[PDB]
């Protein structure tokens, strides 16, 4: 396997994001006060912008991808046409333990929790075989496929960039929460206009998959898709946050939807509205 992707750094304030349905209930016009794992309001969320060059002037740079998994994350990419393709949540990313391999090609999602040989820089190679020959992916992410359990092979996770009307499309948000032997993944794809950085708005999230597997996941890093020509100049926009145990008051709407919330802790004003 090859090591080629490098990552830059930045910081930004996640104004108000991460509120999600804790469970499926039709609670309508209900001021619930659920306490669970959430993303703190106005928290400093990083802005990883993984960048790749075709390969020349190696200029001694060390690799430096690495990411922790304290509680849950808030991977909230913004990129338009699918390049972010999946995540490799694990604890050692070696032949010793288990690790998820969420992979989202054009027609399926391939969650394949398994002892993998993830090397220092995984990535999906989409290579051109013939003049057209459709599109084919391969394996530089893993090289072992050791003893492990079954897959999940569901409908594609990220949608197929429905962008006909000419806008800067969905702010893809996911909240990967691991608890009590379950993997809970939520999703939401609220569209945005040209220049956005997760504006105001208390938009909620919906559960997508509740994976029954239970692991000691403590680290992760997202899989990019490099279009083979040596590969073309890739790019990405990570938005890895970090969840904290916070108490929220959720302001459910008429049609069971969530439209407003408050963290009860940012300000004494917020606390007073939290205790009513």
């Amino acid at each position: 396997c090859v090591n080629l992707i490098t990552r830059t750094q930045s910081y930004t304030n996640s104004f108000t994001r991460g509120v999600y349905y804790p469970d499926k209930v039709f609670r309508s016009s209900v001021l619930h006060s659920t306490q669970d794992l959430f993303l703190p309001f106005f928290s400093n969320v990083t802005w990883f912008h993984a960048i790749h060059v075709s390969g020349t002037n190696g200029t001694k740079r060390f690799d430096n991808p690495a990411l922790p998994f304290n509680d849950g994350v808030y991977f909230a990419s913004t990129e338009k046409s699918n390049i972010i393709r999946g995540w490799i949540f694990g604890t050692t990313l070696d032949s010793k333990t288990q690790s998820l391999l969420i992979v989202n090609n054009a027609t399926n999602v391939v969650i394949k929790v398994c002892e993998f040989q993830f090397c220092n820089d995984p990535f999906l190679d989409v290579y051109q075989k013939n003049n057209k020959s459709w599109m084919e992916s391969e394996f530089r992410v893993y090289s072992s496929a050791n003893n492990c359990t079954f897959e999940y092979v569901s409908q594609p996770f990220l949608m197929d960039l429905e962008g006909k009307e000419g806008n800067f499309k969905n702010l893809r948000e996911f909240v990967f929460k691991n608890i009590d032997g379950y993997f809970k993944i939520y999703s939401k794809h609220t569209p945005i206009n040209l220049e956005r950085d997760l504006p105001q708005g208390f938009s909620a999230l919906e559960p997508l998959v509740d994976l029954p597997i239970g692991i000691n996941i403590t680290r992760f890093q997202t899989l990019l898709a490099l279009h083979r020509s040596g590969w073309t100049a890739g790019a990405a926009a990570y938005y890895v946050g970090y969840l904290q145990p916070r108490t929220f008051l959720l302001k459910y709407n008429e049609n069971g939807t969530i439209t407003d919330a408050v963290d009860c802790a940012l300000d004494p004003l917020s606390e007073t509205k939290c205790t009513l």
């Epitope: 090591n3 390969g55 020349t56 190696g58 001694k60 060390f62 690799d63 220092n120």
Partner: antibody, heavy 121, light 111 residues
């Protein structure tokens, strides 16, 4: 995948030395190639990188500009050079390769062969 | 610089499991999570034994296990046989754009 360097070389103090290492068994341009030093019986030291794809020719601040490493892909060799050596180094030199395809992380293996550049009055 | 300085010499017994330490600037080890533990067999070229904190390469018999807490690193050699009298060297990428090699740990065993 075994590497090879030049033979033992000797120079008087205050002179130049030009050592060479040749790669084999893999794609020379893909992998990095480092240079290291250690006085006889003393701790190791690391020079820099000669990434064959494009001359990076890095070095530590201690040797900044003193060492001028050059690549050669056609012969699959690495050329590493000194300047103004007066009994300071007189050490054993190893051409180093790192465990990485493409952009590299400084974890060394396949430490060449080993050459004893010797300088003394 | 040579900020990473470890034990000058350590001793052990056959069967015992002695740990050698890597000490240097806490920025170098605390800031970045890269350490290396190249062995040095006397009279010939060194070689790697664990390329990351706890990631072993091929052909090391799974006898060496790494650790890290702020400015700590070790191999935890299992048996400490007679062949392990070879010198040991630590190294880690720096906060600055350079690589520092430790010097010392001339391990000794009974005999």
């Amino acid at each position: 995948v075994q590497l090879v360097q030049s033979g033992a070389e000797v120079k008087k103090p205050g002179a130049s030395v030009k050592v060479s290492c040749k790669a084999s068994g893999y794609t020379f341009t893909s992998y990095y190639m480092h240079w290291v030093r250690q006085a006889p019986g003393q701790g190791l030291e690391w020079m820099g990188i000669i990434n064959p794809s494009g001359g990076s020719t890095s070095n530590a601040q201690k040797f900044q500009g003193r060492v001028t490493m050059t690549r050669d892909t056609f012969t699959s060799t690495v050329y590493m050079e000194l300047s103004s050596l007066r009994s300071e180094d007189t050490a054993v030199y190893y051409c180093a390769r790192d465990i990485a395809r493409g952009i590299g992380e400084y974890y060394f293996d396949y430490w060449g062969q080993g050459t004893l550049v010797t300088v003394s009055s | 610089q040579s900020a990473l300085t470890q034990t000058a010499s350590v001793s052990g017994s056959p069967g015992q499991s002695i740990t050698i330490s890597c000490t240097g600037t806490s920025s170098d080890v605390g800031g970045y999570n890269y350490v290396s533990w190249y062995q040095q067999h006397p009279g010939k070229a060194p070689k790697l034994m664990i390329y990351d904190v706890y990631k072993r390469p091929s052909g090391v018999s799974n006898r060496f296990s790494g650790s890290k807490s702020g400015n700590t690193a070790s191999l935890t050699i299992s048996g400490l046989q007679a062949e392990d009298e070879a010198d040991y060297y630590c190294s880690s990428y720096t906060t600055s754009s350079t690589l520092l090699f430790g010097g010392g740990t001339k391990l000794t065993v009974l005999g």
